[PDB]
């Protein structure tokens, strides 16, 4: 449209809707519980941010925000993606080392934290405020990655693949409080169709680079 | 009031809180522990519907939406009622049968992306999108139509009174995406009140009605 | 800063902050897996009544309603935190006695009918039916303590600790619906700033002071 970062939300929607349906039809044919789990878990990450990256495309998931005295573009719908589909890969996660029930809560939770929070500093009219909101959020976060990293007799090809995607998460997801902050939500230092851009790179290697690793491991068979 | 569909409300919020009361009455006394499942999510599922029945009832759940150029009445409180109770008529059929997880995270995902996108849809301003995001929740429905009947040593018992409910779930849950589209929210080709009155006929028999066969079988119990 | 009642947001803000800090050391080291689950449920329940507080310091959780022709300052934030923290309070309640799911479900059912009905009170601009919301809410939060009370071979720790945080429930709960009646949202009877105070002192006794009791006693270990 005359939204100069339509490309991206067309670009992203046809990219989630593509995994979506990949996913899809790989699973066809497990009956393996276990592995049962990884797929389900995997193709609805992708299938939920189809339809808000459709949303966007379409105006919807987008709302003006007065702060700085002008009206700011804000994608909100972002953060309801965001609010299902980051549990759902803690859980592919950790359903892969079989963590303890009490330290999946603790990892849903936080990342409840850090959604919720990101939407309130993105919805939040007093300028500087936005990135009090943004630091809980990145505090929440900082949390999640490092539970990933020192709160885990794993068969070795779990250890290995677990080992990949933990990887893939600490490097995909510390760049979200940065492309943030220094987009049209924080300081206004990237437009908003390059952050745009961005944020459809990091959500297609998150979601689909992420799940074509993880469903194409022997990690998730029992 | 002077909104003619009033009277159908006004039942539906009756039948809703009498079916409540009587599953309520009905689960005193169960121990069994199987059987103590059924019974609360059974239980819980027309106390939902009764309070978002009220909320239309008092006008609280009801919305204006611009499109074709009028001010379009639009229920969103139905979409609170069915984003949990839907998932958990779900989970109704699941124990039953001791579905795998994975098969249930599945049908409570995809049933959490039929009635978001519903409710996307019933709240969009342009005309041709209501539609484009009526055909994703179809979609949706059609996913966890066939898994009710292609995805699943049951004791006989079981066996029967799944294929019933199954049978009741698939005609009633087909209903709902044809009234929507003939509907005040679709093409408008019947009145609000007409498909108010049907939306009261479907949600009694989908969860009363259900209800009362579920409950009544030796199929909940060890 | 001009609302009377900061003071006291700024309090339970700093009161939940350094609660969530407090039991977050204190569960560092924690290995038993039982134990785990009780530091994760406990922990996050002043993290996000933390959020909650500070969103309403900073004036995000406020809205202006309109009923008896004023416009009546109304915190919601406070139902957001709600929604999450009172059902994972009583599932801290629920595994110290090892509760059966059926009974579980029931409970957090029960819970979020309470709350989401407070909330429709809340936003309501009907005054007269303000009160019916309250009375439905009122009548849930009365199913969950007839629960705790008559739905419950638990060692002997576990009952004594049981014991004592069902007592602590029941009373600061019942708080609430009172403390609500009489203030800005209800009746008027009390000034914005003295319910806004009292509803700190129970939060924090609720939040922080049940999570002390708890996460001292030998109950939480296997
Ligand atoms: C758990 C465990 C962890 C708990 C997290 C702690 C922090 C809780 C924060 C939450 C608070 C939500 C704020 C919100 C709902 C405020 C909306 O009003 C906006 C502010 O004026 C108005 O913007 C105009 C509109 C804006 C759009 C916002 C819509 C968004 C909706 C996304 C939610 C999704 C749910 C799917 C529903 C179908
Ligand atoms: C560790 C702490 C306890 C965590 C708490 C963090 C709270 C930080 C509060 C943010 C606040 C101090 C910044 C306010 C913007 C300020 C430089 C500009 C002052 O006024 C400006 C124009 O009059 C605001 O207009 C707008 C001009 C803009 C384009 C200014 C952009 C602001 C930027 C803020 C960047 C914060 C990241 C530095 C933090 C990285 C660590
Ligand atoms: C997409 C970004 C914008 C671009 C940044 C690209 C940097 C590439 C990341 C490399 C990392 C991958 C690790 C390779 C593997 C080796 C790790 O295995 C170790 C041995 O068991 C695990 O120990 C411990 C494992 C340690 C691994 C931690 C990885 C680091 C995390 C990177 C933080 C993020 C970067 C922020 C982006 C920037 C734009 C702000
Ligand atoms: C999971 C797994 C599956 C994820 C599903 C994928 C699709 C996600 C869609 C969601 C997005 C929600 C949209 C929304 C929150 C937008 C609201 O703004 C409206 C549009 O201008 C304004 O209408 C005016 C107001 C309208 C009223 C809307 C209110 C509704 C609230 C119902 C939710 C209930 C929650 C109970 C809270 C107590
Ligand atoms: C399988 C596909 C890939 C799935 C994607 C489906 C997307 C469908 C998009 C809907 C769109 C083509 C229909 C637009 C309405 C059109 C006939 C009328 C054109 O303009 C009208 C008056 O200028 C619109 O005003 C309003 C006049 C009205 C009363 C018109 C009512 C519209 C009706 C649409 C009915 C769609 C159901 C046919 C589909 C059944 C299959
Ligand atoms: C069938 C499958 C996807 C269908 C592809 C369509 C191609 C869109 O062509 C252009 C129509 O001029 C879209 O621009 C039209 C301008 C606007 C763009 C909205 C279209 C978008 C649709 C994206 C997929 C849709 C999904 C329909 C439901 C599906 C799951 C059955
Ligand atoms: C309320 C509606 C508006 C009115 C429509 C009433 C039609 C009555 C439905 C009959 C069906 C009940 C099946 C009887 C039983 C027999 C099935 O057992 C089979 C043997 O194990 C199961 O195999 C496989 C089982 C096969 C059963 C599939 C049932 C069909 C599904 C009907 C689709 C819906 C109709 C849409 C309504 C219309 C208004 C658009
Ligand atoms: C389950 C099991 C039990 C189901 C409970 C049954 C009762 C369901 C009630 C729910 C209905 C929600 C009502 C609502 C979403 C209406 C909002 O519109 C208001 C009324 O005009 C406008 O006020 C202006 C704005 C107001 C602010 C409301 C925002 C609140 C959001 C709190 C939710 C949190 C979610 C975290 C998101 C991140
Ligand atoms: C067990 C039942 C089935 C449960 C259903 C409960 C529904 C109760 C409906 C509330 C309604 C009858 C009270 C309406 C207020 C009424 C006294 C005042 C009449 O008009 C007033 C001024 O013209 C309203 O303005 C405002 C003046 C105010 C300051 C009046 C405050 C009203 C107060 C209501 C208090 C209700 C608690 C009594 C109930 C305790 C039991
Ligand atoms: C006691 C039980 C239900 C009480 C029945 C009441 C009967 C309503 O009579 C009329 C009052 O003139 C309702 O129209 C009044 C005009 C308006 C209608 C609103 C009333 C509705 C109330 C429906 C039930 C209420 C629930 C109160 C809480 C209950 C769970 C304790
Ligand atoms: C904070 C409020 C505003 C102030 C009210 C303070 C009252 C203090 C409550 C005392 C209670 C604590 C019980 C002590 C212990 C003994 C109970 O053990 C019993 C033996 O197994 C359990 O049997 C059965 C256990 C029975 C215990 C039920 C306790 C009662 C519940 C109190 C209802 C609430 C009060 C409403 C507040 C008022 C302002 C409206
Ligand atoms: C059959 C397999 C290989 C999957 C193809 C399904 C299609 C959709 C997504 C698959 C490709 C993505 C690879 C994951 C990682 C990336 C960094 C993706 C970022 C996007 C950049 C655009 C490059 C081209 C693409 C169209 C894939
Ligand atoms: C004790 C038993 C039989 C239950 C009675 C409790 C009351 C409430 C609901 C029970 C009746 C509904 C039967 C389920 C199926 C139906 C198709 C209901 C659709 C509604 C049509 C109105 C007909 C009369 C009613 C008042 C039940
Ligand atoms: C190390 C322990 C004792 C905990 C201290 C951590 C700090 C935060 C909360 C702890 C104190 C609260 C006790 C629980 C019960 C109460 C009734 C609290 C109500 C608040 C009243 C204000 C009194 C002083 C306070 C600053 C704690
Ligand atoms: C599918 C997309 C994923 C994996 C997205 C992850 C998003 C985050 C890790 C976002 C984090 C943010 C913060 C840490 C700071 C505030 C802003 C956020 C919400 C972008
Ligand atoms: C208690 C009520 C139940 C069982 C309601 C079920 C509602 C659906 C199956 C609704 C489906 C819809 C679509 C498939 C298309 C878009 C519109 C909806 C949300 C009405
Ligand atoms: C952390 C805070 C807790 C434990 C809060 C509990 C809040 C309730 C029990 C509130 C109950 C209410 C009713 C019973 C009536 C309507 C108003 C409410 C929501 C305040």
């Known amino acids: 449209t005359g939204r100069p970062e339509w490309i991206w939300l067309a670009l992203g929607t046809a990219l989630m809707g593509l995994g979506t349906l990949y996913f899809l039809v790989k699973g066809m044919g497990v009956s393996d519980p276990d592995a049962k789990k990884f797929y389900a ?3 609805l990450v992708p299938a939920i941010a189809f339809t808000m990256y459709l949303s966007m495309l379409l105006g ?3 709302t003006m925000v007065p702060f700085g005295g002008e009206q700011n573009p804000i ?5 309801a993606d965001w609010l299902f589909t980051t549990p759902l890969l803690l859980l ?8 303890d029930q009490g330290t999946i809560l603790a990892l849903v939770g936080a990342d409840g934290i850090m ?3 990101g939407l309130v500093g993105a919805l939040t009219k007093v300028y500087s405020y936005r990135f009090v909101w943004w630091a809980i959020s990145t505090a929440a976060m900082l949390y999640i990655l490092y539970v ?13 693949t677990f080992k990949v995607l933990r990887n893939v998460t ?3 997801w510390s760049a979200y409080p940065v492309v943030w902050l220094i987009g049209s ?3 206004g230092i990237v437009p908003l169709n390059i952050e745009t851009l961005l944020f459809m790179v990091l959500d297609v290697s998150a979601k689909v680079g992420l799940g074509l690793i993880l469903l194409r491991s022997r990690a998730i068979f029992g």
Chains 1, 2, 3 share one sequence.
């Open 185 to 187: 939500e924080g300081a």
């Open 92 to 99: 592919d996660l950790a359903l892969l080392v079989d963590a």
């Open 148 to 160: 990933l990293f020192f709160g885990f007799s794993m068969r070795p090809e779990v250890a290995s």
């Open 115 to 117: 959604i919720g929070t």
């Open 60 to 62: 919807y998931g987008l």
């Open 170 to 172: 600490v490097v995909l």
């Open 41 to 43: 878990i995997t193709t």
């Open 75 to 79: 994608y909100w719908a972002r953060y």
